[PDB]
Design a protein around this ligand. Structure first.
Ligand SMILES: CC(=O)SCCNC(=O)CCNC(=O)[C@H](O)C(C)(C)COP(=O)(O)OP(=O)(O)OC[C@H]1O[C@@H](n2cnc3c(N)ncnc32)[C@H](O)[C@@H]1OP(=O)(O)O
Ligand SMILES: CC(C)(COP(=O)(O)OP(=O)(O)OC[C@H]1O[C@@H](n2cnc3c(N)ncnc32)[C@H](O)[C@@H]1OP(=O)(O)O)[C@@H](O)C(=O)NCCC(=O)NCCS
Length: 283
């Protein structure tokens, strides 16, 4: 019923809009299993008008936002209340966002999509699958037994920049500045895995009060398949539990779901899974 429809276009979300968006997020999560990446901490800050809110009678039923991370693409999050899907809401929101993307002269759009939900018809429309991002959690208080490999583990320091940059150069090709900034945030640590005296991998740890989060996990391609990734992740799990945390979270990017079996074996369960699909503007 169009009388009650309205689209609000904003530079940031006030506290009520954030509450509304979190309610919408929750109802999509229950229907879909996973949700797009919304970067709530970015929406809360004033930016210089990339959030588009669809209300029906003042109830938030649709949301789209644009995120200028890349220098030659833009990330797009779109969510529509399950009650109101297939009525053109997502298409209305994308149309509102396009002028702003064109004006910035970006031409490539990258959408984060709940795992498995849309693959059939994203393919039809010409989207290209890029990779997936999985957020997992291990809520077991028991440490991981075994998984011992001939590795030593070191906490990285500002002196390990060559080692860290070398690892990233092979896995995931200004890394000096990024590792310096990470190593200067007291919530972060990086564990380096050594085989004899050659660095062969690393994992980042972000510490919070009740949990810690593993990310940016790398094992050199030529050293994979020897148990080293499992040994490093087990080392990290046990380090986190020995500080008294009750949860280990994990953020991993993969092009293939089978790479996830390692983490399932170590007791992780998926809490959120997104697939990233790109498309050029003129479509
Ligand atoms: C292009 C994107 O928006 S990727 C968004 C990924 N986000 C999510 O998946 C979050 C959970 N899912 C949702 O919120 C919704 O299902 C969305 C955002 C994917 C689509 O929202 P809707 O308002 O229902 O989409 P809308 O009704 O505007 O349809 C837009 C187009 O996509 C098509 N479409 C939408 N959903 C589907 C679907 N499940 N299956 C097949 N086609 C679909 C429509 O046929 C339409 O095509 P058309 O322009 O040729 O007529
Ligand atoms: C960490 C990662 C790279 C794998 O590293 P790895 O050293 O090859 O991992 P492992 O050798 O420990 O494990 C490989 C397999 O052997 C199993 N394994 C490890 N130790 C084992 C042990 N004692 N007993 C039985 N199985 C074991 C693992 O469960 C794993 O499962 P799979 O065969 O079903 O796939 C991968 O899991 C990943 O996360 N990829 C996405 C992130 C990424 O690609 N970063 C860039 C790397 S270049």
């Amino acid at each position: 019923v169009p009388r009650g429809s309205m689209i609000t276009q904003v530079n940031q979300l006030d506290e009520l809009q954030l509450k509304d968006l979190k309610t919408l997020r929750a109802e999509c999560k229950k229907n879909d299993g996973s949700i797009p990446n919304l970067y709530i901490h970015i929406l809360k800050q004033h930016r210089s008008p990339t959030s588009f809110l669809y209300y029906q009678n003042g109830a938030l039923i649709g949301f789209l936002s644009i995120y200028f991370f890349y220098d030659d693409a833009v990330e797009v999050a779109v969510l529509v209340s399950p009650q109101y899907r297939r009525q053109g809401i997502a298409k209305q929101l994308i149309k509102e966002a396009l002028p702003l993307i064109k004006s910035q002269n970006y031409f490539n759009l990258i959408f984060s999509c709940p795992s498995r939900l849309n693959d059939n018809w994203l393919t039809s429309k010409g989207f290209t699958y890029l990779h997936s991002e999985y957020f997992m959690e291990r809520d077991d208080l028991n440490p991981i037994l075994d998984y011992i490999r001939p590795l030593s583990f070191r906490m990285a320091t500002l002196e390990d920049i060559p080692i860290l940059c070398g690892l990233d150069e092979v896995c995931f090709p200004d890394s000096v500045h990024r590792f310096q900034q990470i190593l200067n945030e007291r919530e972060y640590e990086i564990v380096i895995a050594m085989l004899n005296n050659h660095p062969i991998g690393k994992s980042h740890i972000r510490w919070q009060t009740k949990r810690a989060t593993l990310s940016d996990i790398a094992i050199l391609p030529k050293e994979q398949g020897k148990g080293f990734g499992s040994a490093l992740i087990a080392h990290c799990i046990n380090m986190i539990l020995s500080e008294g945390k009750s949860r280990v979270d994990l953020d991993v990017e993969t092009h293939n779901k089978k790479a996830l079996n390692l983490y399932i074996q170590l007791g992780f369960h998926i809490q959120n899974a997104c697939d990233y699909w790109s498309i050029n503007v003129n479509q």
